[model samples]
Target: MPKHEFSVDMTCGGCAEAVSRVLNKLGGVKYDIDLPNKKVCIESEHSMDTLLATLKKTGKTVSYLGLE
Candidate 1:
């Protein structure tokens, strides 16, 4: 699996929760939401294509995302 680090402009718990749902829906993936930093680290076999599309669909600003 690949590890990814990213930060999103999430406004609230619901928004953060939404991220969880999105990741959960994608198998072989996991996330750790750092609300204080609005940061997240994900582990998945999926590619950047999957992640970028997934995050964009949440309607949040992904301030950063790349292999880490």
Candidate 2:
């Protein structure tokens, strides 16, 4: 398993729902979102490239992607 920690400018329930939907489409990723901090923690078996690519589809900037 791999984990990614990053910042995303998610501000509302709509944004959260949108990202949540996109994540589900990426083949079952586990995610914890900190709205106050605009942070996201994701765990999955996918590589960074795949995670980045799929996340990029959700219209949010995902940053600081590294092994965790």
Candidate 3:
């Protein structure tokens, strides 16, 4: 599995919740959201482009932070 990290502009619980909800919908991916740093870490078999696109659809800015 590949692990990816993203620096997102998440400022509150709602932002975290929104992102979590979106990622959850993708299914079969393990993810962690760090509210304090506005970061999201995910381990998945899916493509980075697909994950990123899904995150972007949450209406938040998602910046790639490289692999973990």
Candidate 4:
């Protein structure tokens, strides 16, 4: 699995939950959400573009922070 960090504009637990649901919809991923720092770390075999596109569905500002 490839590990990648993303910067997401998550304000509170609700935003975090939104991120969670969106990722679950994409599937094939194991993730951790750092609500305080507004960052989301994901481990998956999926493509970076696909992952990024999926995250954007939450209507947050999302950016890939490369592989971890």
Q: What is the C-alpha lDDT of each candidate?
A: 0.77, 0.75, 0.83, 0.82
Q: Which scores greater on TM-score, model 1 or model 4? A: 4
Model 1 misplacement above 4 A = none
lDDT for each residue of candidate 1 in 1-68, tens digit (9 for 90 to 100): 87888887678778788888887777667777888888888876788678777766777766556686
Q: Which sections of candidate 3 miss by over 4 Å?
A: none
Write the residue-wise lDDT of candidate 4 on 33-57 in tens digits.
8877889898888887887888787
Q: How far is candidate 3 from the true structure (C-alpha RMSD, Å)?
A: 1.3
User: How do these models rank on lDDT, best leading?
Assistant: 3, 4, 1, 2
Query: What's the CA RMSD for each of the models?
Result: 1.5, 1.6, 1.3, 1.3
Query: Model 1: which residue pairs collide?
Result: none
Candidate 2 lDDT over 11-68, as tens digits, reads: 6767777777777888868877777788878887777677778778777665655577
Query: What TM-score goes with each of the models?
Result: 0.81, 0.81, 0.86, 0.85
* Positional deviation of residue 5's Cα in model 4 after best superposition, in angstroms: 0.5
Worst 10-residue lDDT window for candidate 4 reads 57-66
For model 3, residues 1-68, the per-residue Cα lDDT tens digits are 88999987776679888888888888777888888888889998878788888778877776788775
Per-candidate total of colliding backbone pairs: 0, 0, 0, 0
